[PDB]
């Protein structure tokens, strides 16, 4: 009885693979072979933000492109002003094993979570704990706001969840993965999202329905980071096999691979520039690499951290980049 | 305006300095063990969908915080990375039960990790009385899992406890050397293993932890002053 279903899965997979190969007539490399490159790219450190006591796991820019929130494992959330390096807020957490943070698009709330399996929500404009969300059975690894009353979370119990905050009830659940979900990203229209896990695959989910649209494979090991293209029709991922890859939603297959023969360490973070022409990646060497997206050439290096780079971010106007690592410092590059 | 912002920033900095002064003086420990081990009994011998638990105690006016893991899954190659800067790892093993190969494999995987290769381990071999009763019963053999035990002799430089039978000493020493071989085989020269024999009625484990942490901090001091 089980063998028949396994066979059926086999023929279905073969049909999908054949139909997918039937559409690949050219490559991205052969179509961009006749464009002028970007050249060499220099960036310089403008600010250094000091004040944390231990590792830094997460960051998130505000929508005004001025204010930051950062999370460390001494048990602190700090909210910074970046033009003047002032401190605006410092929030102590009840559990110190925090792993993610987010900033509300209206600027009124922040959120965090970690090894306690609870997502906590703080109100900034009254700082007291506004609410706590409980119901996952594994550590919380990511979270992003949709508006001031909805939130989407990913856990290390192989499921995603969508929560309504005022009632405090888990209103939708997204299942289908087989390993720890490690990252999320919201589409620019905020009606779809992609997730990636430790089974080496990525999935596209419809928010309004609760069902998976598409599955993407091709990596060799666990996937740590994920991001959308500014257009909303493609996305890029990074893994522990020391490789980045670019996939397309409409053609339903991989488009490009960014890798080098002297890089044998995993990738912890990815991000796009404002026009989508550069791709920035944070590494376990100790530093960051800047790639050309349309020709797969390495264009620049950002160096200057003394430990493992943990997180990156680019503002909503494209003016600056912010990087944080395990040496307890945040740096702003321009 | 600007003056109010600078004033608020300075007040926050004062509070942060106060917090750091007390953060730097506490010792954090991570506790690991399997279900068949008596780990909860050990944590219950200390006097001062939830994911993690903490226990606080004090010895000689020194503060210890010890952490234990609650509702997680089997996979642990992602959340272990959170514990790269703890002072020590306390590893509990049930020495009367076999499942010893699983314990040895766990210890070998913990010892050689990339983000945990500067952290020292205090090893607790639990349930000594059960092992003694099993050895004296004579209905079970150790050559069924570790054949090399057939050709092992207790060293002449041993210091047995007064009153123990030779057989119990031989079994004890073989089992301990099994873990010490893994500890010394790779190594780094930058971290050490401290083994102890324990039961469920001992009132000496807090003192043992105190002493080993004293030695760990002394070694780190000697390394930072460039003397060893």
């Amino acid at each position, epitope marked *: 009885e089980l063998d028949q279903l396994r066979q059926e899965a086999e023929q279905l997979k073969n049909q999908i693979r054949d139909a997918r190969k039937a559409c690949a007539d050219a490559t991205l490399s052969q179509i961009t072979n006749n464009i002028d490159p970007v050249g060499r790219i220099q960036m310089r450190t403008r600010r250094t933000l000091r004040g944390h006591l231990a590792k830094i796991y997460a960051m998130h820019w505000g929508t005004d492109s001025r204010l930051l929130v950062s999370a460390s494992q001494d048990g602190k959330l700090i909210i910074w002003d970046s033009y003047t390096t002032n401190k605006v807020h410092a929030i102590p957490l009840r559990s110190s094993w925090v792993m993610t943070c987010a900033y509300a698009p209206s600027g009124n709330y922040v959120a965090c979570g970690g090894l306690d399996n609870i997502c906590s929500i703080y109100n900034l404009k009254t700082v007291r704990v506004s609410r706590e969300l409980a119901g996952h059975t594994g550590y919380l690894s990511c979270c992003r706001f949709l508006d001031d009353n909805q939130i989407v979370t990913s856990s290390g119990d192989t499921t995603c969840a969508l929560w309504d905050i005022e009632t405090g009830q888990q209103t939708t659940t997204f299942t289908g993965h*087989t390993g720890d979900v490690m990252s999320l990203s919201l589409a620019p229209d905020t009606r779809l999202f992609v997730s990636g896990a430790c089974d080496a695959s990525a999935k596209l989910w419809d928010v309004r329905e609760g069902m998976c649209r598409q599955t993407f494979t*091709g990596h060799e090991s666990d996937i740590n980071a994920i991001c959308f293209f500014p257009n909303g029709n493609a996305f890029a991922t990074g893994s522990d096999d020391a490789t980045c890859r670019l996939f397309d939603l409409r053609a339903d297959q991989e488009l490009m691979t960014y890798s080098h023969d002297n890089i044998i360490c995993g990738i912890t973070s990815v991000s796009f520039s404002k026009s989508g022409r550069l791709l920035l990646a944070g590494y376990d060497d100790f530093n960051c690499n800047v790639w050309d997206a349309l020709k797969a050439d390495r264009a620049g290096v950002l160096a200057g951290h003394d430990n493992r780079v943990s997180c990156l971010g680019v503002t909503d106007d494209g003016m600056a980049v912010a990087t944080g690592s395990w040496d307890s410092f945040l740096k702003i590059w321009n | 305006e600007d003056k109010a912002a600078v004033e608020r920033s300075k007040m926050i900095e004062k509070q942060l300095q106060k917090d750091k002064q007390v953060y730097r003086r506490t010792l954090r420990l991570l506790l690991l063990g399997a279900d068949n081990s008596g780990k909860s009994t050990i944590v219950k011998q200390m006097r001062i969908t939830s994911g993690i638990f903490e226990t606080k105690f004090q010895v000689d006016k020194v503060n210890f915080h010890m952490f234990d893991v609650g509702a997680q899954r*089997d996979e642990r190659r992602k959340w272990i990375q959170c514990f790269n800067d703890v002072t020590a790892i306390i590893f509990v093993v049930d020495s009367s039960d076999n499942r010893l190969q699983e314990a040895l494999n766990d210890f070998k995987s913990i010892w050689n990790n*990339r983000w945990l290769r500067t952290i020292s381990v205090i090893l607790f071999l639990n349930k000594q009385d059960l092992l003694a009763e099993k050895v004296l019963a004579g209905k079970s053999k150790i050559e069924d899992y570790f*054949p*090399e035990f057939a050709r092992y002799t207790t060293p002449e430089d041993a210091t047995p406890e007064p009153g123990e039978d030779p057989r119990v000493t031989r079994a004890k020493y073989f089992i301990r050397k099994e873990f010490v071989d893994i500890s010394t085989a790779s190594g780094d020269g930058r971290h050490i293993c401290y083994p102890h024999f324990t039961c469920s009625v001992d009132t000496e484990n807090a003192r043992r932890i105190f002493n080993d942490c004293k030695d760990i901090i002394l070694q780190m001091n000697l390394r930072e002053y460039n003397l060893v």
Partner: nanobody
Amino acid sequence: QVQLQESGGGLVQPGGSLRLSCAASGFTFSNYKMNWVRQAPGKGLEWVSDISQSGASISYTGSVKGRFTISRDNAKNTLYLQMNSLKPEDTAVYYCARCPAPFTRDCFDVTSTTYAYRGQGTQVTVSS
């Protein structure tokens, strides 16, 4: 797509011999370590044997030393286990596994839950 496929298995008399093979596809076979694991009727998952990336280092459990041998083939992307002098206490389902990351010394999680880089397994029975 990572894929592992095992072959061999069957029913043998006590004191017999067998040779299991495994074919791997979808990754650089020569960058990883390889593992043989087994599960018995009514028990959990148990580690059986270990081999490194260049074939230099080998490792077995105490209860199989002197009877089982592990071997590697990088050009053909194949792993082999040779079992001699079978006992009735070897009746089990065998699986092949590889470590989660390349160029590394520590190993994977031997877990009942869905470990993504394990095969379906083959059945071996030793009885008369």
